[PDB]
Structures are given as structure tokens and as C-alpha cells.
Design an enzyme around this catalytic site. Structure first.
Site, short mmCIF file in Angstrom:
data_model
loop_
_atom_site.label_atom_id
_atom_site.label_comp_id
_atom_site.label_asym_id
_atom_site.label_seq_id
_atom_site.Cartn_x
_atom_site.Cartn_y
_atom_site.Cartn_z
N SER B 107 -58.71 106.22 -89.92
CA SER B 107 -59.57 106.11 -91.08
C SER B 107 -58.87 106.62 -92.33
O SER B 107 -58.60 107.81 -92.46
CB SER B 107 -60.87 106.89 -90.86
N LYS B 188 -73.11 112.58 -92.40
CA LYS B 188 -72.69 113.08 -91.11
C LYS B 188 -73.14 114.53 -90.95
O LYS B 188 -73.22 115.26 -91.94
CB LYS B 188 -71.17 112.95 -90.92
N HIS B 225 -70.25 115.23 -83.58
CA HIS B 225 -71.08 115.21 -84.78
C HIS B 225 -72.04 114.03 -84.79
O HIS B 225 -71.82 113.02 -84.11
CB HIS B 225 -70.23 115.20 -86.07
N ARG B 227 -74.15 110.98 -86.86
CA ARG B 227 -73.99 110.04 -87.96
C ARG B 227 -75.37 109.55 -88.40
O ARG B 227 -76.13 109.03 -87.58
CB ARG B 227 -73.10 108.86 -87.52
#
EC number: 3.6.4.-
Lengths: 313, 313, 313, 313, 313, 313
Positions: B107, B188, B225, B227
């Protein structure tokens, strides 16, 4: 929010009271004028710029030492004043009435929005002088009729149905007397027709309200429309509508209050206004407003899921 | 979203592979170059501006005929390239590995956000070179460790708790490779610590999510995590994470997937990813995603009321 | 590219269907409206801003979530809508026909260019209402006649001859529905007269095309003009004109296709369209498009040299 | 285009001639100075701003009455002057030579482009002082070596190959002495290496030239690079290179002329320069330039088709 | 400076030749047109934008490759064209004459200045259509009359007397066809009346000329006014007026030349034009222009002192 | 034009008077201060911003009620103050002298121009601290030496010769204390060397003065340079230099007056200053200034013709 006497003065011509707008420089002169304590309720002669409003309404006008009034030096002041005059001139007001009529407090923002409607070629009010007059006379408070979609103050249409039309009030963007709090968000839901609304159409409105406006409470001030307000504002609205209810009771002026569809209105608000309408005290009413009320029948239980799953598909 | 080979090339000095950034004019030269079909995977010599990326990655770079790549002529390209080099240079990469390492897709936006963190004096990454390296190596995919708050990509903190930190991804505001769809909104939720989270802290997170982000689905791509994505995007996310799951299964690369707290994750997403993790087909998984699933135990039933009534008070 | 029903609605007055433009705020209201699945093909009543297009054409209008439609809030939308109405109102359309007429898909860009012509005092269309009507009715697809120079959509004249006029299509510069791809370049060559063209005049056109537009393919979509398109676009054009050919065959609508001068048209395009016109499959036609076809007789062999040597002298 | 004596003057220090740049205000003073007819070739003392160029070169500098010179008051003047000094100072020029060296006319634009190269961190000249010196000494005409890609003046790389690099000359965008004719377009093709070039690499160059630059003639002025010029300019180029050839013959200065690859060069140009190199008259040479020469073996016959069909695919 | 045929074309209506202006897009089309060598002197049909000027006058119009013509796309082009038409339409031009009339070269700048006069309410030409026609017909060269103050082209009045009016020509500030040389300064001195001028009034003019315009030569081109030009331009003026004199002699067109007051005109210019008028060669005339002529009787000896001492007092 | 005491104050450190600049806010404080009539000549203590100038010089500083002073709040004030200090600090001024030194009135504009010289790398003063000191000490009036080209105040060089340098005084463009009259034009002619000047070099100067500056009188104020002033100003200059002459006679300060070359100076000015220098009255001197003096021997008779004829050639 000010008296009609802030925009025009009456003049007896042809054995009839025609109302005339104020020149802004006349208002400006009055603000600098030294007047007797017993002339504060009389219309002021500026000499150079014609008649001016009574000095008692000084605080209605924005100056260096005042940001609580209107911007009378704008073009929209003249437009609003003209709208008011046009409306009042159609009524053929009698000599006894002129004082009561002009002392009527009205929403300046409502009137401004009506100006924005009437001047747009696309809007029906631009073409129908009758509809414009009806709309204005509702805003003035010289009409028994209810504000509907056709006669609504205006704003940006954010949702529309067979039964309902939702408007965003653009009071931040006004010229004459805007809302200064930049956090301000408020919508209104006017009925398109008075004839009975279906369960399906109510469902559609409540769906959009639970989805797009979930952080907003659905209330009313007793006229024929819903008010979509932040939950943080409800307590203040309560105070206002109760004070109004109280005032109308004491003064004997009409005190009708349409509670509107119980399935649409916020549970706590409906409780509040029902207690008020039953003649309970402010504290009695207010206390219901803050109660963690046991969830009624929804009354539309699967509604929030439907729109989620639609969005996913 | 591009290969590491888009930003740097390896150079063997002092019997070690140190990775060097590309000059943008070298990239610009390569884009105009006529190369043999059998040299498309080799690093290109621009002569004047040094080494350039393999011509096969032409479409990774924005040109007149391409808006799907990155803006390599920006300053942030050099910053990201430098960040990558700094990270890779710490690993002492072996000759066999260099190709695999550079062919790794990563990314670019993640890396850009890490740059924005490291350059801000206020951010811990500015002061801790170790934390910066850990963060970057996670982004590169040359680290077994999980992205937490401390090592998060970044963005605007919109909510914080003992257990959680919510970030708004400002991909619209990026320089190197922004999101072009102006409707884009994504958050996030990174964990502050890995140790067990209380019911009270989970309640606090779920409260904010149901209030402020009611039009958003709570999901995960299997790392540590959450989203927060629009319901309209979930179907696409599903495709992506399934394709990844499928790909990792076929290639034998690590395929761990943390489903995360079932009380926080969206019911349908948890169902979807559970079916995927059990080895079911895309269609089997997807079909659960679209099912009007019978409401589970909430599992926090009075939560949406609490915040409303707080706002009113 | 949209239906005529996107711009106007029919109204039966004086026992005749006169077509009326839409107010943009009516369109804007419809976009926010909740309509029944069985009313999606009916004209929508906005109440405040008059009639609006059928909700099924929602995607024809640009919104926050849509950049594939037109900019209906522009002034050119009203201009185009007015042009359409003016044209349709001259036809005295019958009750059975109104639906077919309005459901006709047309080039919005063509119509916009006609507006740009009609409003310019210098242009013949400004003065001849008859020529304007003919031009518009061709664009609407309610005319058997062929588009020629006189009745051309417009653009910047880049070349002109006794026989031909070349126009640069300025679709990038449009207001209503532009081309968004900034690489877009396209010209058209309209015939000035239908009477037979000389070899000398054909030579002159082919000379300019080989010199100034060497990176462009000379094609046609079967009407009486040439289309000058990038070689990179030809494959897509092929798909479009074949799909059209196929569609007209299946629906029984006119399927005339003028292949135009074989000496002017690109060899491969002429081969393609000849195979299509003979009733061959898409793949059969397309395969000719990509063949390294043995060079025919030129048929003008010294033409490219002539212009070079002229330039040198 | 001006003498080196326009930028610097020689100073004998440490028994060596070090060349020093001019202050622009010294030049400005000289332009206003009243000088004797017999001092017009002597360096001028401005008193306040140091030494200034010989008054005979007045027309080399842009004033109110002159737009044919350079903009000496710019920053790039000082940069170019410094570049020249740096180069000349490395040569240890003898007392007899200083006059000849400084009287050498050189391309100011070439020097400006070299400045633009040397100041860019991305460019090899920024890092290699030796390469910079070689490049500059070629531009000064105090070097036997040939200008190649490595030592090229510069510009925007528009094409690159194993064998060749094509540059767009951005003379319009210059600061010191731009081209004022806004129609100006010119490219140059420098060789990357002197070792023999393959047929395949020549084909690749000729392909791009026939496709992208079809309205340009491929020529040379006899050094080791191609010049891509508009066909409208060739006649003027011919005059220039012939005048140079003539001048070098009369003055006995080196008169080597590399005709370059006959397959790449324009047929008529090759004919022209071959006749010149054989010692024919201007008129004899020029007449070949304008002859509609019988097409030689192509010598690459299917080349223009290949790129078309590639573009289509 | 161009032919009248650059602005209008003749049309035979009502058995009379009325002249019509060109649309700029018609001119623009003609510039892109491919015309036969034998049609270069015929008016061109643009089809879309009406008739256009003969292609032979291509260079009269500014393009990308031409800055020597006029800016035909400006508004002033239409204004000038209209002025010309208005003037020519009053003459009732016969069929034999139309060609000669239109082929007449005229000063575009003169015509532009007349436009600037006629459009200003303050100027007499705005009110007197007769004076405007006289003025224009002088500029067209279809009038025997002399240009005086009343009928002057215009400019900024910098000095005025009983006898004279001095104008600054603002050719730099023009729209249609300006002077591009920014050094340009030129004045003209028109006579107010034709009746005899006194010595005192001549003295006053010569005083201002010797004081304010000492770096200017006082000349004439043989019409009834003085031209105040830089001494650096006189040589070029000489060439022009001699070429004109020569041309008129050969073609038999009127060749009157008013030398004007010998006391006002520059000695050398008077000598030059006297020799020309006597029928001497260019070289004979020119040589007088450059002679350090023995100072004649002044003929006003104390004149330059007077103004100095006035300024001091 | 102000006292040195307006820029600095003396401080006794290390048994020596070092002069220190004023902070502008100290000056600003003093302007608002209430001071005793007997402290008006004492330096003022601002407390916060250090020492400030004596209140008696209030009118030297520009305020709301004063535009006759300097702009002390500018950066150039500090620069000038620093220049003054630097100069005075080199003199080692004694205790008795400090008052006389600081009470000396000087040209602020002269000092500003010296700042503009010293800060420019191109100017010799930037490199020679000795020349800068000499120049400044002349401007301060603490130097017996004459202002020459090397030590000139500065400006734009408009002409230069072996013997002379002409400067345009750019007092309009100053920051600290500009000329406000926008008509202001003045030049000065400084001698390059003191050794005797030739007739040829004098001729060259007088030529340029008669050609380019014909509307200017050539004078002097008795130092070693010429002043080129408008004829309209001479009368005022006369008053000033006579008042100075008178003042120096009465106070016994040096009263040398260099009349300069009689061939260059304006006849009337030379007469005026000669009478003054002989000890005649103001009226006696002035009356010569206005006399229409019989033209002396020119003394260069053909000079104005030469330049005209040169310009023509």
C-alpha cells in the site's frame, strides 16, 4: 425574529391603510436619534429618508454594539419589507387593528426563504401570486391555514415522497438575519396533502430519518409539519414551545397543537407535548423529556436493517 | 498499490545489497523508452538520470494516458522511496531474496501516511527510529508483527479509548497516490494494547460506532484492527479479502485471519469471513453477506438510547 | 448520450402534444425521491418545481455518486432542452408516438454543438430557422436526411475544400456532458454537396489527412461523413458500429450503411464494415481490422511527397 | 549566439590568465558609454561595477532598441558566464591565444541547457565535474570531442533506445536568450555509444520518427547527432551549414562533416550535404534539396504500417 | 496597412453595389481552405459563416505563423469594416469601379483612430455624420479633400494653437493592427484652417517643437499636415515617400506634394522633397538628407532662449 | 534632510564615544511623550525600547500629522543609522565635539543611496570598506574630500565618459525619505578623475546634455560635480545655494565654491554664482539669473547638429 413594525409603517390613503417599507438610511438615522421616553413607541421622522421604525425596536437592528438583530442595510431587508407590505396591503386592515398587526412578532428567516422562493422562476410561487400570498400570510400570522409543502418556507429538498417533503433550512446562508452558530443543522418535513397518509409512506419517511438523520430528534411545534433537530437542541425547543403554550393560554390567542403521527415523532417529545397539552407544569413535562423511556412498540421493527441490506446490495 | 520495485533498485556494495531510490526523470525516460520484450523485467538505464524501474511496471506511473498509477514526479514519491530504502537496508537482504522482496506489492497510501507521521515533531515516530522501522516493515510486509495504534499508518484521530484508537484515512488529501472517488470515507480502529479488553471499553467503542458512524459497516481484513467502511463498499471488500485468502492458500504464504471481537464486527461480515475461514466457496460466503440475518443477541441492547439521552442532557 | 425523455415531458394542450423543458430543481428533487418500483417509468411530480423525468433515468444525471451523466444544473441543459422542444413541437407528434419519440437515445454533445452554432450571429443557423430545425431533427433521429456541412453539429473548422469541411470536435470544452478523457481528439469530415466529387478534391482531402493527421484513422459510422479518430480508438468504434448494426437488424429499424469513398477510408476499416454489411460475425469482421493487410493500390502514390516538398519550398 | 568575450574578460594573476565574469551593471554602463572608434574592441572600465565587454558587442545585449541579443540582467547570464569561466580556467590559456579563444562565437542556448543540467541533482553532470567540463568545452568549441547523449546540451527526453536518445529543445522556455518565434519546434538525436548500431535499433528510431515526427525532416550539421526540424526550416538550415562549410574552407579551420546514417537522414538532405562535401556550389547543392527525388529503397518498407497496427491492437 | 477587400465584399442588391463586412470565422475558414491557384483572387465562400476575403490576402491576417497582419478576430475589426462599408455605401459605386476601389491599400490604424473618434460622445464626429463620412473617405482614399484638424485621424492632443493641433499617435495602444516596436513615438500637426497662418502662430508651433520635441524631425508626406518623427526614422520615411512619388508617376495617379512651410519643416527634409519633386533620383535626393547643411537663416533665432527663460520665471 | 542626532546617540564606553542607532519604537514612544520645555534638547529614555532622539526633532519623523519627515519605521532607517554609526565610530570623536557632530544636518537621500551602493555585490563599495567610509564621511560632512564618481551617492548611470559619469537620482523610489513630487527629475555629473579634462571629452558631455537633456539646466552647488535640473527649479536652487553661502559667511565655516567648467555650466547660472562669490546681494545675483543674456561664444557651435545627423545615419 422581530415585529412587523420593524419593516413597514401604515399610511392612510384613499381611506385605507397601505403599508410602506422603510428606507435603511431612515433606520440608520433613528439609531442615532435622541428621542423622548414617551415617544419610543412612535414612528420616527428622519426628515431626509422618510419614516423610520419606533425607537423601542432599536435592538432589532445590527449595529457596532449589536449582533443580535437583522442586517437592515442589505437588499434582502427591502425584499422582505416589500413582501410584508404586499401581503398586508391585500387585507384592507382597519384602524383599530393596525397596531396589533404590526406588533406581531414573526420569523424573518421564514420570510427570507419565501423571498428566495418567489424570485426563482422554477418555483411555483413565482407564477402563482395567490400561493405566494397564502404562504406569506401564514408566515405573518394573519392566516388560519397550515403550512404545507406547497406553502412551505423553503430550503433544499433532501427527500421527497407521495406524502412528505423534507427541507434543509439554509439559515447559515441567509443575508438578512442568519444563524451565527456554524454548528446549526435543522430540517423540516411538510405534508404534501392533508388527506390520510398510508403506512407504507410513513415507513418510507421513518426509514430515511433513522438512516440519514439518526443523530436528529423528530419533533413538532404543533403546526402541520415535523421539525428535525439535533438531540442537543431538544431541551431548548421544549422550553420555547411550552413558553408559547403558556403565553397563548394567558392571552387567550389560539392554542391548537397538532401532536402529529405518534409513529414518526420521537417518543419522549410526544410524551412531553402530551403532558403540556394536558395542562401539566414545565417541570412535569420536562422530566418526561429526560426519562430513559421503556421502548414502545417500535412501531417499525425491521426498518433500519432493510436500508442497510439495500445499501449492501 | 504497487511493487517495491517501483520505488528502488538493489545495488551490491561492500558485499551487501543496499537499495537506492529512483530519480523521477529516470522513470520519465523509461516511459519513453523502446525496450525488447525480453528486457521488460530488467531495471532500465536512463544514462542521464541513473537507474529506472523495470518497463513492465509502466502502468504503475501516471502519464497522459494513465491516471491509475502514482504521481512519481511529486516530492512524496522520493520520501516514500527513501522510507522503503531505509527499511530494506536494515534487513541485510540476501542475493536470492532481493527479487521476491522487491516484487512484493504494498500500500503506497500506507507508506505515505507513515511519512506524514515520521516528519511531524509531535509524532512518536519522529523520535523513535525503532518504532518507525517496525511500522514501515509492517507496511512493506517484511514483518510478522501486527499493526497497532503505536505502529498505525496514521490519519486524523476521531475517537480514542483505553483500548482503541479510531483514525480517519485522509486518502483524498494524499499527494503520491490519492483516492480519486470524492465520496471516499473510511476509518480504522487500531488496538492500543494486545492484552484483554474489558466489556466497558468495548461498549464505549460500539457506542461511538452506532452513533457517529451508523451508516458504516464494521469489518476487518484479518489483521489486528477494524475497518469502518460504507455499507455500499462491503461487497467489494468481501471480494478482495476472499481473493487474498484464495491466493495465499494457493501460494502457501501465511494465511492467518483474525476475525476480531464478534460483538464489534458486523454480523454479516463475521458470518462471511467465518465461512471463508472454514474453506467454503466465494458464492457460499457472499450469500451470507446478503442475508437478512435474524438479529443475534445485540449484544448491547440499550446502547443507542444511552447516547441519545446523554446528548439531550 | 441519453434519452429525449431526460430533457422534456409531453403536455396535451389544444388537442396537441407540446413538449416542455424540465426545471433543474425538479430533476434535483426526483433524485432525492422515494418512488415505487412500478412508477419508475412515469414522469415525476416535484410539486414545487414542476414535472421531472422518469426516475429510471437517474443515472443520466451527475450527482455526488455519479460522474457518468450530464450536468443538468448548467445553463446549457436548458438550452439543449429548449432546442429539443422547439424541434419536437414542429412535428405535431401523435399520442401513440410520444413514448417512442422520447425513448430515443441521442447525442447530447451533438445537440450542445448545435446550440453553440444557433447562438452565434456569424453562423447560418442563427438566421435560418429552417436549417436549424433540419439540423436538430437529424440530431434527434426524427429525420431521414443526411448530416452535411450546412447541417453539421459544428466545432472548429480545421480544413475546407470545394467538396469537404473538416471539424475538430471540442467535446473537452463542453458544459453539459463533456468528454472527461483529456487525451480525446476527434475530427469529422462533412460533405458540402452530395453531387459527385472530383479526383482532385479527394486528393486534396487525403493529402491533408496523411500530412496533418497521420496518427489518425479515417472511418465512418455509415452516415454521410468521415470520422477522424486515433488508431487506438478504432477497435472500440468497431464494437459500437457492429452492435448498432446488430441491434437495427434485430429491431427492424433502418440499417443503411454508407461505406463512403474507398480511396479515403482506411483499408482495414473498409474491410471490416464490408464484412459487417455482408452479414458476417463480429469476430470475422474484427479479425480483418487487425490484419497486416497487403497494401492496395495507394491509390494516390506521390501524395505525401508533394506536401513535404511544398513545405520545403 | 555570441562571442565568449560577451561573458568574461581575462585577468593575468599568478602568471596565468584566469577569466572573470561580468557584472550586469558594468554591461549596462558600457551601453551608455561614449567610446572612441579606436577603443571599440577594448574591454571597458565601468569604474563602479568593474570591467565590461568591448563596446563593439553592443548589439549582443538586449536594450530598448534591441531584442536580438541576450537578457544579460538575468541570473542565467551570471550562471552561463560562470560556466564559461570554469571551463576556460581549466585550460591554462596562453597570452597569444586569449584573443582567439574569447572571439569564438558559441551557442548561448547550448550553454544555458548545460546549466540546467549541471544544477539538477538527478543529472550526472551535477555529480561528475569531469563530464561537465567535457560537455562545456564541446559547447565552447575548445574540444575535439563529439557531443553524445552523456555530454548532450539537454532538453526533455521524448524517446530513448539502446543506441539513441531524442531530446526536445526547450528554447522557448529559456531565460537568457530564448527563441521568440512561438512556432519553434526542434529535437535532436544524440548517440549513446559510438560503437556500431544494429539494424533493429535504427529501425526503432526511424519508426518513432515516421510516426510521431512525420512533419519533421531528419538532418545533421555534421557533428555526431541528428537534428529533427520542420520541413519549412530545412532551406534555412542548408544555407547555414553551407556558409559554415564555406567559411571553414576559407579560414582553414577543421571542416569535418559526418553525414551520418543514410537510412535515417532525409534523402534530399543527404544529397545536399554530399554535394556540398564534394565541393559543389550553393546553387548546385540547394537544387538537389528541392528535387522531387525518385524514392530510394525505403530502406524500411513496412515500418509505418507496423506502428499503426500496434496502436490498433 | 491593407486593401479594402480585406474588410468587405460587394453585393449587388436593388441594382446597386452595397458592401458588406466579413465575419471573422469566415476569414478563419478561408485561412484553412485549399483553393485553386486561379481562384486566389476570388472571394471565398465559407458556407457556414458567409463570404470571406480573397485567399491572396492571407498574409494580411495574423495567424500562428504570421504577426505581420491584423487581429481580425477582435471587435475593432468589425468596427473598422462597418466604417468602411458605411463610407463606400454612400458612393454608389459602379460595376467597373468595384475592383479598383476594393484593391485600394489604406491605413488600418487611421481607420481605427476614426472609430475611436466616432464612438466618443465628446468628439464632433459622433454628432456630425457628414464630418465622419468626409474623414473616412479621406482615409479610404476616395476623396480629393485634405485631412485637417476637424477631419484628423485622432490621438491625444499634446498642443493646440489658433492655426495648429498636434496629436500623439497612440498606435501602440491599438487593438486591430498596433505598432509592435515599443520605441515607437510619432506625432502629427494638422491645420485648423486653410486660410493663411501668421508669423506669430508659426513661431508658437516651432517653439513647442524645438522645446518639447527637440529629438524629433519635422517632415511631411505631401498632404496638408506635418509629421513629427524620430531622427532615426527619417531615412525610412524618405524611402517610403520617394517610392510613392515614383509609383504615382508610373501609374499616372495624382502626384501632388505639398512641401508645407519651409520655416517649420526640417531643412534637410525640405531639400530632399524639393529634389524629389524636381524629378531627381533617389540617391540624389537621399544624399541631401545626410548633408551637414550650412545653417539657413534660422528663421527664428531667439526662440529656444525665450521658452527656457519663461520656464525659469 | 535632517540632523545626525535623528539617527544615533553617543555612548561613552572604553573611554570613547561610540554612537548607537535608535530603535524605531523608542522614537515612536518619544513622539507620544510629555517632556519639559527644558528637556527638549536632551536624548529621551523610552525605558522599554532604549534611548530615543531629542524631542525637538519631532517634526523630522513622519506621523499622522506630518508627511515632511522620514519613515523611521522602515528597514532603511536602521540601515542608514548603522551606516552613520559605522562612519562616526571610526573618527574617535571627542567629548567637546559630539554635540556639533550630531547637530550636523545631512542629506538622508544621499545616505540611502550609499546604502543601496554598499549592499550591492557589483558595487565597489561592497568590497572596499575604505571607499565606503570615505563616501559616507563626505555625506556626513566630516570630510574635506570631494565627491567623485568613485565616492558618488549613486543612482542609475545614464551616460559615462573618460572624464564624466551621469547619474539619475531615483529619489522617487526611496524608502526612507523620498521626493513626493512625482514630477521630480534630477541628474548629477561626477568627475571620474581630478586631472585635467580634454576639450573632446567636455564636448562629448555637452553633446549628450544638449541632446537628451535639453529641457534641463546645468548647474552646481560648488562641490566637484554638476547638477542637471529642470529650468523650472533653477530659481529655487539659486535661493538655496545663496542662503548657504550667506550662512557659511556668517558662521565662519568653510565657504569654498567651485564654479566648474564655464563651457559646461549654464551661462545664467555661472553669472549668478560669480556675482554671489564676489559678495553681491541676493537681488543682484538673482537678476542675472533672469536676464535674456546675449549669447556668448557657444562655445561649441556645431554640436547639436552633429548628433542629429548621426541619428539620421
Amino acid at each position: 425574529m422581530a415585529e412587523l413594525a420593524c419593516f413597514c409603517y401604515p399610511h392612510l390613503e384613499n381611506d385605507s391603510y397601505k403599508f410602506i417599507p422603510f428606507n435603511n438610511l431612515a433606520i440608520k438615522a433613528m439609531l442615532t436619534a435622541k428621542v423622548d421616553k414617551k415617544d419610543m413607541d412612535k414612528f420616527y421622522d428622519s426628515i431626509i429618508y422618510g419614516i423610520a421604525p419606533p425607537p423601542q425596536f432599536k435592538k432589532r437592528y445590527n449595529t457596532n454594539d449589536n449582533s443580535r438583530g437583522m442586517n437592515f442595510e442589505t437588499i434582502m431587508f427591502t425584499k422582505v419589507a416589500m413582501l410584508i407590505c404586499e401581503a398586508l396591503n391585500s387585507l384592507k386592515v382597519t384602524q383599530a387593528n393596525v397596531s396589533n398587526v404590526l406588533s406581531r412578532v414573526v420569523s424573518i428567516r421564514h420570510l427570507e426563504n419565501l423571498v428566495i422562493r418567489k424570485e426563482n422562476p422554477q418555483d411555483i410561487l413565482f407564477h402563482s401570486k395567490d400561493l405566494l400570498l397564502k404562504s406569506t400570510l401564514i408566515a405573518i400570522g394573519q392566516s388560519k391555514e397550515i403550512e404545507t409543502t406547497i406553502t412551505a418556507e423553503g430550503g433544499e429538498i433532501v427527500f421527497q415522497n407521495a406524502a412528505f417533503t423534507m427541507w434543509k433550512l439554509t439559515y447559515l446562508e441567509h443575508q438578512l438575519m442568519p444563524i451565527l452558530d456554524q454548528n446549526f443543522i435543522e430540517y423540516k418535513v411538510t405534508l404534501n396533502e392533508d388527506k390520510p397518509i398510508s403506512d407504507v409512506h410513513v415507513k418510507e419517511l421513518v426509514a430515511e430519518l433513522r438512516w440519514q438523520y439518526n443523530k436528529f430528534a423528530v419533533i413538532t411545534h404543533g403546526k402541520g409539519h415535523y421539525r428535525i433537530v439535533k438531540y442537543s437542541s431538544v431541551a431548548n425547543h421544549a422550553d420555547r414551545v411550552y413558553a408559547t403554550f403558556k403565553s397563548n393560554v394567558k392571552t387567550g390567542v389560539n392554542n391548537d397543537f397538532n401532536l402529529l403521527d405518534q409513529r414518526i415523532i420521537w417518543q419522549n417529545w410526544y410524551a412531553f407535548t402530551s403532558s403540556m397539552k394536558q395542562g401539566n407544569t414545565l417541570d412535569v413535562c420536562k422530566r418526561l423529556l429526560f426519562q430513559k423511556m421503556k421502548p414502545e412498540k417500535n412501531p417499525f421493527k425491521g426498518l433500519s436493517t432493510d436500508r442497510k441490506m439495500d445499501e449492501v446490495s
